[PDB]
Amino acid sequence: IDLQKTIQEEYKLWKQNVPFLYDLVITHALEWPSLTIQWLPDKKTIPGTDYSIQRLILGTHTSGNDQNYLQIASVQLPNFDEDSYTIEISQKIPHDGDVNRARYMPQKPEIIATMGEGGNAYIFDTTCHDALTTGEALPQAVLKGHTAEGFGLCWNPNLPGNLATGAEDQVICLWDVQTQSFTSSETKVISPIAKYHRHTDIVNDVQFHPQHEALLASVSDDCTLQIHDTRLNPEEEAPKVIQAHSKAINAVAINPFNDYLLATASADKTVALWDLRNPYQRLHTLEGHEDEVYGLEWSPHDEPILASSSTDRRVCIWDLEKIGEEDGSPELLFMHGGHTNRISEFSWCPNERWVVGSLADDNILQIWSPSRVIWGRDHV
Protein backbone atom coordinates (compact mmCIF):
# COMPACT_ATOMS: atom_id res chain seq x y z
CA ILE A 1 0.00 0.00 0.00
CA ASP A 2 1.16 3.53 -0.85
CA LEU A 3 2.90 5.30 2.05
CA GLN A 4 3.97 8.93 1.95
CA LYS A 5 7.73 9.22 2.53
CA THR A 6 7.57 10.53 6.11
CA ILE A 7 4.89 7.96 7.04
CA GLN A 8 7.04 5.19 5.59
CA GLU A 9 10.02 6.47 7.60
CA GLU A 10 7.99 6.48 10.82
CA TYR A 11 6.60 3.00 10.27
CA LYS A 12 10.05 1.57 9.87
CA LEU A 13 11.25 3.31 13.04
CA TRP A 14 8.21 1.81 14.78
CA LYS A 15 9.00 -1.72 13.51
CA GLN A 16 12.58 -1.35 14.73
CA ASN A 17 11.36 -0.58 18.27
CA VAL A 18 8.58 -3.19 18.33
CA PRO A 19 10.66 -5.85 20.18
CA PHE A 20 11.35 -3.50 23.12
CA LEU A 21 7.95 -1.82 23.45
CA TYR A 22 5.64 -4.78 22.75
CA ASP A 23 5.16 -8.33 23.90
CA LEU A 24 3.11 -9.12 20.76
CA VAL A 25 2.46 -7.59 17.35
CA ILE A 26 0.48 -9.30 14.58
CA THR A 27 -0.21 -7.37 11.36
CA HIS A 28 -2.56 -8.11 8.46
CA ALA A 29 -3.99 -6.25 5.51
CA LEU A 30 -7.66 -6.77 4.71
CA GLU A 31 -9.08 -6.73 1.20
CA TRP A 32 -11.27 -3.78 2.18
CA PRO A 33 -10.84 -1.21 4.94
CA SER A 34 -13.11 -1.74 7.94
CA LEU A 35 -14.76 1.09 9.84
CA THR A 36 -15.58 -1.09 12.83
CA ILE A 37 -14.05 -3.81 15.01
CA GLN A 38 -15.22 -5.71 18.07
CA TRP A 39 -13.88 -8.87 19.69
CA LEU A 40 -16.51 -11.55 20.16
CA PRO A 41 -16.60 -12.94 23.71
CA ASP A 42 -15.75 -16.61 23.00
CA LYS A 43 -12.40 -18.35 23.27
CA LYS A 44 -11.77 -21.77 21.83
CA THR A 45 -8.91 -23.66 23.48
CA ILE A 46 -7.20 -26.41 21.53
CA PRO A 47 -5.76 -28.58 24.31
CA GLY A 48 -2.08 -29.26 23.74
CA THR A 49 -1.45 -26.04 21.80
CA ASP A 50 0.34 -22.78 22.59
CA TYR A 51 -2.54 -20.72 21.21
CA SER A 52 -6.29 -20.21 21.33
CA ILE A 53 -8.77 -19.22 18.62
CA GLN A 54 -10.62 -15.96 19.12
CA ARG A 55 -12.93 -14.01 16.85
CA LEU A 56 -13.49 -10.44 15.69
CA ILE A 57 -16.36 -8.69 13.97
CA LEU A 58 -15.25 -6.56 11.00
CA GLY A 59 -17.09 -4.70 8.31
CA THR A 60 -16.25 -3.23 4.95
CA HIS A 61 -16.30 0.21 3.42
CA THR A 62 -16.21 -0.05 -0.37
CA SER A 63 -15.09 2.55 -2.90
CA GLY A 64 -18.60 2.28 -4.34
CA ASN A 65 -20.74 -0.30 -6.12
CA ASP A 66 -18.73 -3.27 -4.85
CA GLN A 67 -20.60 -5.44 -2.39
CA ASN A 68 -20.12 -4.75 1.33
CA TYR A 69 -19.85 -7.47 3.96
CA LEU A 70 -20.21 -8.01 7.64
CA GLN A 71 -17.30 -10.34 8.44
CA ILE A 72 -16.12 -12.54 11.27
CA ALA A 73 -12.38 -13.20 11.45
CA SER A 74 -10.90 -16.11 13.41
CA VAL A 75 -7.53 -15.31 14.97
CA GLN A 76 -4.86 -17.59 16.46
CA LEU A 77 -3.74 -15.76 19.56
CA PRO A 78 -0.69 -17.20 21.34
CA ASN A 79 -0.84 -18.02 25.01
CA PHE A 80 1.16 -15.61 27.19
CA ASP A 81 3.77 -17.46 29.26
CA GLU A 82 4.69 -16.79 32.90
CA ASP A 83 8.13 -17.50 34.40
CA SER A 84 3.43 -16.35 12.67
CA TYR A 85 -0.22 -16.94 13.65
CA THR A 86 -3.21 -17.26 11.33
CA ILE A 87 -6.09 -14.83 10.74
CA GLU A 88 -8.81 -16.13 8.40
CA ILE A 89 -12.20 -14.66 7.47
CA SER A 90 -14.56 -17.29 8.88
CA GLN A 91 -18.01 -15.86 7.98
CA LYS A 92 -18.86 -13.28 5.33
CA ILE A 93 -22.43 -11.93 5.21
CA PRO A 94 -23.65 -9.55 2.47
CA HIS A 95 -24.43 -6.10 3.90
CA ASP A 96 -26.27 -3.25 2.26
CA GLY A 97 -24.14 -0.09 2.67
CA ASP A 98 -20.87 0.54 4.44
CA VAL A 99 -20.81 -1.19 7.83
CA ASN A 100 -20.54 1.98 9.89
CA ARG A 101 -20.62 0.08 13.19
CA ALA A 102 -21.29 -3.47 14.33
CA ARG A 103 -21.97 -4.86 17.82
CA TYR A 104 -22.87 -8.34 19.06
CA MET A 105 -25.73 -8.70 21.50
CA PRO A 106 -24.17 -9.38 24.92
CA GLN A 107 -26.86 -11.88 25.92
CA LYS A 108 -26.89 -13.67 22.52
CA PRO A 109 -23.57 -13.12 20.69
CA GLU A 110 -24.71 -14.85 17.47
CA ILE A 111 -26.93 -11.77 16.96
CA ILE A 112 -25.08 -8.80 15.44
CA ALA A 113 -26.51 -5.32 14.88
CA THR A 114 -25.06 -2.88 12.35
CA MET A 115 -25.58 0.71 11.24
CA GLY A 116 -25.81 0.73 7.46
CA GLU A 117 -27.14 2.37 4.34
CA GLY A 118 -28.97 5.68 4.69
CA GLY A 119 -29.53 5.25 8.42
CA ASN A 120 -31.12 1.81 8.37
CA ALA A 121 -29.85 -0.46 11.06
CA TYR A 122 -29.73 -4.21 10.43
CA ILE A 123 -29.83 -7.32 12.60
CA PHE A 124 -28.07 -10.54 11.57
CA ASP A 125 -28.29 -13.96 13.22
CA THR A 126 -25.10 -15.75 12.24
CA THR A 127 -26.79 -19.14 12.72
CA CYS A 128 -29.10 -18.15 9.82
CA HIS A 129 -26.08 -17.63 7.52
CA ASP A 130 -24.18 -20.81 6.65
CA ALA A 131 -23.43 -23.34 3.91
CA LEU A 132 -26.97 -24.76 4.08
CA THR A 133 -28.86 -21.52 3.34
CA THR A 134 -31.00 -21.98 0.22
CA GLY A 135 -31.61 -18.38 -0.97
CA GLU A 136 -30.24 -14.85 -0.64
CA ALA A 137 -28.40 -14.09 2.55
CA LEU A 138 -30.79 -11.55 3.99
CA PRO A 139 -30.62 -9.53 7.19
CA GLN A 140 -32.91 -11.00 9.80
CA ALA A 141 -34.32 -7.54 10.55
CA VAL A 142 -34.05 -4.02 9.21
CA LEU A 143 -34.58 -1.20 11.69
CA LYS A 144 -36.26 1.75 9.97
CA GLY A 145 -36.12 5.02 11.84
CA HIS A 146 -33.12 7.18 11.02
CA THR A 147 -33.19 9.54 8.03
CA ALA A 148 -29.39 9.68 7.62
CA GLU A 149 -26.50 7.31 8.26
CA GLY A 150 -25.12 7.01 11.76
CA PHE A 151 -22.36 5.60 13.91
CA GLY A 152 -23.96 5.32 17.36
CA LEU A 153 -24.94 1.79 18.29
CA CYS A 154 -25.18 0.02 21.65
CA TRP A 155 -27.02 -3.03 22.99
CA ASN A 156 -28.51 -2.83 26.48
CA PRO A 157 -26.42 -5.28 28.54
CA ASN A 158 -29.20 -5.58 31.14
CA LEU A 159 -32.23 -5.84 28.82
CA PRO A 160 -31.97 -8.47 26.08
CA GLY A 161 -32.84 -7.23 22.62
CA ASN A 162 -32.98 -3.56 23.65
CA LEU A 163 -30.86 -1.49 21.23
CA ALA A 164 -29.98 2.21 20.96
CA THR A 165 -28.75 3.99 17.83
CA GLY A 166 -27.75 7.57 17.04
CA ALA A 167 -27.22 9.18 13.66
CA GLU A 168 -26.46 12.23 11.57
CA ASP A 169 -30.21 13.05 11.68
CA GLN A 170 -29.68 14.30 15.30
CA VAL A 171 -32.00 11.54 16.59
CA ILE A 172 -31.53 8.68 19.05
CA CYS A 173 -33.74 5.66 18.37
CA LEU A 174 -34.53 2.98 20.94
CA TRP A 175 -35.42 -0.45 19.62
CA ASP A 176 -36.80 -3.72 20.98
CA VAL A 177 -35.38 -6.56 18.90
CA GLN A 178 -37.13 -9.89 19.44
CA THR A 179 -34.94 -12.55 17.88
CA GLN A 180 -36.83 -15.82 18.40
CA SER A 181 -38.74 -15.13 15.11
CA PHE A 182 -35.64 -14.67 12.94
CA THR A 183 -35.38 -16.68 9.74
CA SER A 184 -33.01 -16.88 6.80
CA SER A 185 -35.97 -16.50 4.42
CA GLU A 186 -37.45 -13.17 5.57
CA THR A 187 -36.28 -9.76 6.77
CA LYS A 188 -38.40 -8.43 9.63
CA VAL A 189 -39.10 -4.68 9.45
CA ILE A 190 -38.99 -2.98 12.84
CA SER A 191 -39.81 0.56 13.95
CA PRO A 192 -38.42 2.24 17.07
CA ILE A 193 -40.12 2.11 20.45
CA ALA A 194 -38.92 5.66 21.18
CA LYS A 195 -37.05 8.51 19.52
CA TYR A 196 -35.14 11.22 21.36
CA HIS A 197 -34.99 14.65 19.73
CA ARG A 198 -32.68 16.14 22.30
CA HIS A 199 -29.48 16.79 20.35
CA THR A 200 -29.11 19.70 17.93
CA ASP A 201 -26.34 18.13 15.80
CA ILE A 202 -25.00 14.72 14.71
CA VAL A 203 -25.26 12.07 17.44
CA ASN A 204 -21.83 10.40 17.35
CA ASP A 205 -22.01 7.79 20.09
CA VAL A 206 -24.45 6.14 22.50
CA GLN A 207 -23.76 3.80 25.40
CA PHE A 208 -25.95 2.04 27.94
CA HIS A 209 -24.70 2.01 31.51
CA PRO A 210 -23.23 -1.48 32.13
CA GLN A 211 -24.92 -1.77 35.55
CA HIS A 212 -28.11 0.31 35.11
CA GLU A 213 -30.74 -0.90 32.65
CA ALA A 214 -32.39 2.48 32.04
CA LEU A 215 -29.37 4.81 31.77
CA LEU A 216 -28.21 5.82 28.27
CA ALA A 217 -25.40 8.30 27.62
CA SER A 218 -25.10 10.09 24.25
CA VAL A 219 -22.62 12.58 22.77
CA SER A 220 -22.94 14.83 19.77
CA ASP A 221 -21.34 17.42 17.51
CA ASP A 222 -23.55 19.85 19.52
CA CYS A 223 -20.84 19.64 22.24
CA THR A 224 -23.13 18.10 24.85
CA LEU A 225 -23.15 14.88 26.83
CA GLN A 226 -26.65 13.73 27.74
CA ILE A 227 -27.77 11.11 30.24
CA HIS A 228 -31.22 9.72 29.38
CA ASP A 229 -33.50 7.62 31.61
CA THR A 230 -35.33 5.31 29.22
CA ARG A 231 -38.08 4.63 31.79
CA LEU A 232 -39.53 8.16 31.44
CA ASN A 233 -41.55 9.44 28.50
CA PRO A 234 -39.52 9.89 25.27
CA GLU A 235 -40.27 13.56 24.54
CA GLU A 236 -39.59 14.55 28.15
CA GLU A 237 -36.10 16.06 27.94
CA ALA A 238 -33.13 14.15 29.35
CA PRO A 239 -32.81 14.80 33.11
CA LYS A 240 -29.07 15.47 32.47
CA VAL A 241 -27.52 17.69 29.78
CA ILE A 242 -23.83 18.61 30.19
CA GLN A 243 -21.98 21.26 28.18
CA ALA A 244 -18.94 19.01 28.35
CA HIS A 245 -16.56 20.23 25.64
CA SER A 246 -16.04 23.33 23.52
CA LYS A 247 -15.90 21.19 20.35
CA ALA A 248 -17.70 18.14 19.00
CA ILE A 249 -17.78 15.07 21.25
CA ASN A 250 -17.09 11.91 19.25
CA ALA A 251 -17.10 9.11 21.85
CA VAL A 252 -18.37 8.25 25.31
CA ALA A 253 -17.32 5.33 27.51
CA ILE A 254 -18.66 4.25 30.90
CA ASN A 255 -16.33 2.50 33.33
CA PRO A 256 -17.39 -1.16 33.69
CA PHE A 257 -16.13 -1.31 37.32
CA ASN A 258 -16.71 2.23 38.66
CA ASP A 259 -20.41 2.81 38.08
CA TYR A 260 -19.93 6.59 38.36
CA LEU A 261 -16.90 7.12 36.08
CA LEU A 262 -17.62 8.31 32.53
CA ALA A 263 -15.21 9.47 29.82
CA THR A 264 -15.73 11.62 26.69
CA ALA A 265 -13.52 12.15 23.64
CA SER A 266 -13.63 15.35 21.65
CA ALA A 267 -12.48 17.28 18.60
CA ASP A 268 -10.60 19.52 21.05
CA LYS A 269 -7.94 16.71 21.09
CA THR A 270 -8.92 15.96 24.71
CA VAL A 271 -10.41 13.12 26.74
CA ALA A 272 -12.36 14.27 29.81
CA LEU A 273 -13.49 12.39 32.91
CA TRP A 274 -16.86 12.78 34.57
CA ASP A 275 -18.62 11.67 37.75
CA LEU A 276 -22.16 10.57 36.92
CA ARG A 277 -23.44 11.69 40.34
CA ASN A 278 -22.41 15.30 39.66
CA PRO A 279 -21.94 15.43 35.89
CA TYR A 280 -21.33 19.21 35.47
CA GLN A 281 -18.03 19.03 37.32
CA ARG A 282 -15.32 17.80 34.96
CA LEU A 283 -12.90 15.66 37.00
CA HIS A 284 -9.85 15.69 34.75
CA THR A 285 -8.65 16.41 31.21
CA LEU A 286 -6.32 13.95 29.44
CA GLU A 287 -4.00 15.53 26.89
CA GLY A 288 -1.59 13.91 24.46
CA HIS A 289 -3.41 13.39 21.19
CA GLU A 290 -2.45 15.74 18.37
CA ASP A 291 -5.77 15.70 16.50
CA GLU A 292 -9.46 14.94 17.07
CA VAL A 293 -10.12 11.99 19.40
CA TYR A 294 -12.67 9.56 17.89
CA GLY A 295 -12.49 6.25 19.79
CA LEU A 296 -12.72 5.47 23.49
CA GLU A 297 -12.91 2.24 25.50
CA TRP A 298 -12.15 1.20 29.08
CA SER A 299 -10.04 -1.86 29.75
CA PRO A 300 -12.40 -4.82 30.41
CA HIS A 301 -9.93 -6.04 33.08
CA ASP A 302 -8.48 -3.00 34.89
CA GLU A 303 -10.69 -0.25 36.29
CA PRO A 304 -8.11 2.59 35.97
CA ILE A 305 -7.06 1.76 32.37
CA LEU A 306 -8.63 3.63 29.43
CA ALA A 307 -7.80 3.69 25.73
CA SER A 308 -8.48 6.40 23.13
CA SER A 309 -7.83 6.73 19.40
CA SER A 310 -7.50 9.65 17.07
CA THR A 311 -6.99 10.92 13.53
CA ASP A 312 -3.40 11.54 14.70
CA ARG A 313 -3.09 7.77 13.96
CA ARG A 314 -2.39 6.84 17.62
CA VAL A 315 -4.05 4.60 20.17
CA CYS A 316 -3.22 6.04 23.60
CA ILE A 317 -3.53 4.05 26.81
CA TRP A 318 -4.09 6.06 30.00
CA ASP A 319 -3.42 4.94 33.56
CA LEU A 320 -5.72 6.96 35.81
CA GLU A 321 -3.85 5.93 38.95
CA LYS A 322 -0.91 8.07 37.73
CA ILE A 323 -2.92 11.31 37.73
CA GLY A 324 -1.26 12.55 40.91
CA GLU A 325 1.97 13.40 39.05
CA GLU A 326 9.50 14.58 34.39
CA ASP A 327 8.23 16.57 31.41
CA GLY A 328 5.36 14.60 29.78
CA SER A 329 1.91 13.63 31.02
CA PRO A 330 2.29 10.88 33.67
CA GLU A 331 -1.11 9.30 33.08
CA LEU A 332 -0.24 8.63 29.41
CA LEU A 333 1.03 5.10 29.87
CA PHE A 334 1.52 3.95 26.27
CA MET A 335 1.17 5.36 22.77
CA HIS A 336 0.74 2.86 19.94
CA GLY A 337 2.35 4.12 16.73
CA GLY A 338 1.91 1.16 14.37
CA HIS A 339 -0.77 2.66 12.15
CA THR A 340 -0.07 4.68 9.01
CA ASN A 341 -3.54 6.26 8.57
CA ARG A 342 -6.30 7.46 10.86
CA ILE A 343 -7.63 4.83 13.22
CA SER A 344 -11.15 3.74 12.43
CA GLU A 345 -11.82 1.71 15.59
CA PHE A 346 -10.11 -0.46 18.17
CA SER A 347 -11.32 -3.04 20.67
CA TRP A 348 -9.78 -4.53 23.82
CA CYS A 349 -9.47 -8.32 23.69
CA PRO A 350 -11.75 -9.65 26.47
CA ASN A 351 -9.92 -13.00 26.73
CA GLU A 352 -6.32 -11.84 27.04
CA ARG A 353 -4.93 -9.15 29.28
CA TRP A 354 -3.43 -6.06 27.64
CA VAL A 355 -4.28 -7.05 24.05
CA VAL A 356 -5.85 -4.59 21.59
CA GLY A 357 -7.15 -5.03 18.04
CA SER A 358 -6.96 -1.84 15.98
CA LEU A 359 -7.79 -0.82 12.41
CA ALA A 360 -6.79 2.11 10.25
CA ASP A 361 -8.18 3.66 7.06
CA ASP A 362 -5.49 1.93 4.93
CA ASN A 363 -6.82 -1.65 5.39
CA ILE A 364 -4.43 -2.79 8.16
CA LEU A 365 -5.55 -4.93 11.11
CA GLN A 366 -3.10 -5.01 14.02
CA ILE A 367 -3.29 -7.17 17.14
CA TRP A 368 -0.81 -6.02 19.72
CA SER A 369 0.15 -6.12 23.40
CA PRO A 370 2.46 -3.49 24.95
CA SER A 371 5.32 -4.90 26.98
CA ARG A 372 4.69 -5.79 30.61
CA VAL A 373 7.87 -3.74 31.11
CA ILE A 374 5.59 -0.75 30.53
CA TRP A 375 2.27 -1.77 32.15
CA GLY A 376 3.52 -4.03 34.95
CA ARG A 377 6.06 -1.54 36.27
CA ASP A 378 4.89 -1.72 39.91
CA HIS A 379 4.50 -5.51 39.90
CA VAL A 380 6.85 -7.39 42.24
Author numbering: 20 to 102, 119 to 360, 368 to 422
Quote what the paper states about this structure.
Mis16 is a homologue of the human WD40-repeat protein RbAp46/48, a well-known histone chaperone found in a variety of chromatin-associated complexes, whereas Mis19 seems to form a bridge between Mis16 and Mis18 with its N terminus binding Mis18 and C terminus binding Mis16. As expected, Mis16 adopts a β-propeller fold, consisting of 7 WD-40 repeats, with an extended N-terminal α-helix that forms part of the histone interaction pocket.
We first solved the crystal structure of S. pombe Mis16 both alone and with the N terminus (residues 14–44) of histone H4 bound at 1.9 and 1.8 Å resolution, respectively. Overall, the structure of S. pombe Mis16 and its interactions with histone H4 closely resemble those of the homologous Schizosaccharomyces japonicus Mis16 and the human RbAp46/48 proteins and exhibit a highly conserved interface, which has been extensively described by others. Residues 56–63 form a β-strand that continues β-propeller 7 of Mis16 and stabilises an extended loop from 107 to 116, which is disordered in the Mis16 structure alone.
